[PDB]
Amino acid sequence: KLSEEQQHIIAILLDAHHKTYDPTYADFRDFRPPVRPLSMLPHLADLVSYSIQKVIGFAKMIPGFRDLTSDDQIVLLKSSAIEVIMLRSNQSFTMDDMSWDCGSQDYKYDVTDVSKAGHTLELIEPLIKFQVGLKKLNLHEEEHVLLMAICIVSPDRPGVQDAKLVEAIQDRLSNTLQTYIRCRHPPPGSHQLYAKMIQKLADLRSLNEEHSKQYRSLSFQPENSMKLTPLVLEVFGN
Amino acid sequence: NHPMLMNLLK
Ligand SMILES: [O]C(=O)[C]OC1=[C][C]=C(C2345B678B9%10%11B6%12%13B96%14B%109%15B%1172B932B437B%1285B%1363C%14%1527C2=[C][C]=C(C([O])(C(F)(F)F)C(F)(F)F)[C]=[C]2)[C]=[C]1
Numbered sequence: 644k645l646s647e648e649q650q651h652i653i654a655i656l657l658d659a660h661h662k663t664y665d666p667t668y669a670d671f672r673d674f675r676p677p678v679r680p681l682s683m684l685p686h687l688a689d690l691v692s693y694s695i696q697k698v699i700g701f702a703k704m705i706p707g708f709r710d711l712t713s714d715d716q717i718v719l720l721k722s723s724a725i726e727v728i729m730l731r732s733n734q735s736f737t738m739d740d741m742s743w744d745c746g747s748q749d750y751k752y753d754v755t756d757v758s759k760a761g762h763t764l765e766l767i768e769p770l771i772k773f774q775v776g777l778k779k780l781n782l783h784e785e786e787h788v789l790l791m792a793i794c795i796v797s798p799d800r801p802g803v804q805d806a807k808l809v810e811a812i813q814d815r816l817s818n819t820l821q822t823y824i825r826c827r828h829p830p831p832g833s834h835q836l837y838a839k840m841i842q843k844l845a846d847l848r849s850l851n852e853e854h855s856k857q858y859r860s861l862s863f864q865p866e867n868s869m870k871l872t873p874l875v876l877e878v879f880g881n
Numbered sequence: 882n883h884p885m886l887m888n889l890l891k
Contacts, residue, residue, distance in 0.1 A: 696889060699890065713887060713890060716890055717883050717890070720890075874886075877884075877886060
């Protein structure tokens, strides 16, 4: 059932993820150092700005993405950026202590670190529950990278102009994912896996909404906006 | 409007 075109799409998305996700976390030394109010805001703002650039690199390699206009590519990335970053960070999240382990003690982030960047339990509690539930899915890397692409290319993002073209690109990705689960994911892990994965996308939309709320309250203080980066201000708002 | 996003997209 898995056509050669569908196998082609998976190979590209796997390669795109490997070219944009460094599992050594080497570049983290270039950030402003972490201090453990809002002592973690400089470091974590540098982390998000770094990851936005990686999300852009990944999106450019999604089949069909560069058939969209630059206006549509911009609005899809603006809307999905924080969702894809939260989804990507599942690779560093660990159940042993409910933290994001990125190679060393300096770059291990727990719930208190996120709150030392200006965010509250309104976001942190659903965020942790998202990371746990995603880990319980035990996704193949093939499914992990397909979910990242489906999240970016969604027709209902605000500001989309050629939703019909966005929908066509997403449908080709969704059919690849559904057929992949069918032929390559054995039961019982296969059980309603596609529906469970789309529920995680719905979880990410809610997390996106709460983050935007807390970001605007954060960046409304000029002393806080001083600590952000120019790319973060362009993407998330000034 | 979004010059840095456009540069990374090119
Ligand atoms: O992916 C990998 O495995 C390794 O790399 C990464 C990349 C990102 C994360 C994270 B994870 B917790 B979830 B929150 B904190 B960590 B950092 B983002 B992900 B969200 C995250 C975060 C911080 C800052 C803001 C912020 O709102 C603030 F103002 F700085 F607080 C802004 F940056 F967006 F502005 C928003 C979200 C972990 C590992």
